[PDB]
């Protein structure tokens, strides 16, 4: 049984998701004095979270109905706070730095968890791990160079919260056998609840509605962005169903390279060659960790 | 489902010796690098007592003598300074598949021969075949609406355990697939009880039924047990005991 459909699906869902995200965040709005840049990162994350929650509910209703979720409710909130914070920090970063920087920062996930395990928890790591971070750091340092700006601090906070979310998810999976769909649904529900509370409290839901009134065309794009975000995870899960995790690791590893490649060159940025080499070197750093698993 | 095999059926030990009990599962019980294994110690005519969950995670209050080991499909339990108290039966349980299964049990013998929950089982002792039956487990000192699983388990003659079913405090209930069409578990929170109903009990159902309180961590751990009620299904009457 050939399985190109899942690989395709992922590469056609998350790729377009990135395209819509770039359009929504960095998209030029207005002319002259009408340059009202998209500063409403909370509302889009809220929409994405609710769409993900509904899709996960559908998947649960259609798959593994017999499974019983043993995870405690308060566990989901603890991971969800960092999950939501990581999204808010990452999406907000687009307000100050170009898309390639954000995606590369997202590819920098190993450093937080690796740093924690090696220096905070005092756990030795193999040689390959101790060199993956070095290669990635060299690549990003070359890429970055031509107090600090908000974009870099936002990216750092996003990485820290992503590491915290990863460790919390690891703990809950280990000690509660939480399913993929159940965790997705629950963390999305908690995130959307907290985001609704905050957004209505801060009031920019009204201001976001005003912005939509000024530019009505945004709503058709934000909905599609959320739908693609949900479908990406839905098809990622489908890969496990069709075939075991051996394919899941491969698809994740190849996506972590294809997404950055497309966002770098296929996005048609005005990148100078002096900068592209840095992307090349971080590529030579990226994936090398997956070489040793 | 997963079958657990305990190779040493009976172990003859002398006090002070180090004893190891092996338990092999049919399928890999590893889930995300965590073993979903538990161990229980049963004294004669007593409910099992929970000892270990996963790999070497000794339950609080258990002596330091016991230690679990092994991963994948093969597991072992080691008692290095064996003492008089440890002479009992030992059961290995897996919590990787929705039917939780216990091993046949390994029996040790010696040569030369309010801060808790009170569970109380009740039900008819002797029953004719084909009759519907209902056992009631009443809980005192705790509210079944608080966070704890409440399970019905049974033990046939020969000391073979079989997890019948359970109900969670949310009202979510899980059944043994082999019995999903013969039993039903319900609860009454007003009186703090839960009932197990069996339809058309046959001679094979003769056994000792326990109601237990369990908490999920590295699997399912039946930490608290009731005294257990004996049920005998027969076409003829019995008296005097
Ligand atoms: N059996 C497994 N072995 C290794 N990794 C797994 C297994 N099951 C799930 N995962 C991990 O869970 C993650 C779920 O991905 P997900 O978070 O939905 O993607 P995204 O981060 O793009 O939303 C995958 O990246 C995958 O690596």
Author numbering:
A (entry chain B): 12 to 157, 168 to 314
B (entry chain A): 1 to 113, 485 to 612
Provide text from the study.
The endoplasmic reticulum (ER) cannot synthesize ATP but must import cytoplasmic ATP to energize protein folding, quality control and trafficking. Here we report that human SLC35B1 does not bind nucleotide sugars but indeed executes strict ATP/ADP exchange with uptake kinetics consistent with the import of ATP into crude ER microsomes. We have further determined seven cryogenic electron microscopy structures of human SLC35B1 in complex with an Fv fragment and either bound to an ATP analogue or ADP in all major conformations of the transport cycle. We conclude that SLC35B1 operates by a stepwise ATP translocation mechanism, which is a previously undescribed model for substrate translocation by an SLC transporter.
We were further able to extract E33A particles from which we could reconstruct cryo-EM maps of a cytoplasmic-facing conformation with ADP bound at a resolution of 3.1 Å, as well as improve the map quality of the previously modelled ADP-bound ER luminal-facing structure. In the cytoplasmic-facing E33A structure, the map quality for ADP was clearly weaker than that in all other structures, and ADP was further positioned approximately 7 Å closer to the cytoplasmic entrance than its position in the wild-type structure. Adenosine was positioned along the same TM8–TM9 gate and, although more poorly coordinated, the β-phosphate retained an interaction with R276 together with Y25 and Q254. There was a further potential π–cation interaction with R194, which in the ER luminal-facing state, may help stabilize the luminal-facing conformation. Because the E33A variant shifted the SLC35B1 protein to a predominantly luminal-facing state, we interpreted the nucleotide position as an ADP molecule before exiting to the cytoplasm. Consistently, the E33A cytoplasmic-facing ADP-bound structure was more open than that observed for wild-type apo, wild-type ADP or Q113F AMP–PNP structures, with a larger outward displacement of TM8–TM9, TM1 and TM4b helices. In the return step, we think that ADP will first be repositioned approximately 6.5 Å to the state observed for ADP in the wild-type cytoplasmic-facing state, whereas the distal site observed in the E33A variant structure is likely to be only transiently occupied.
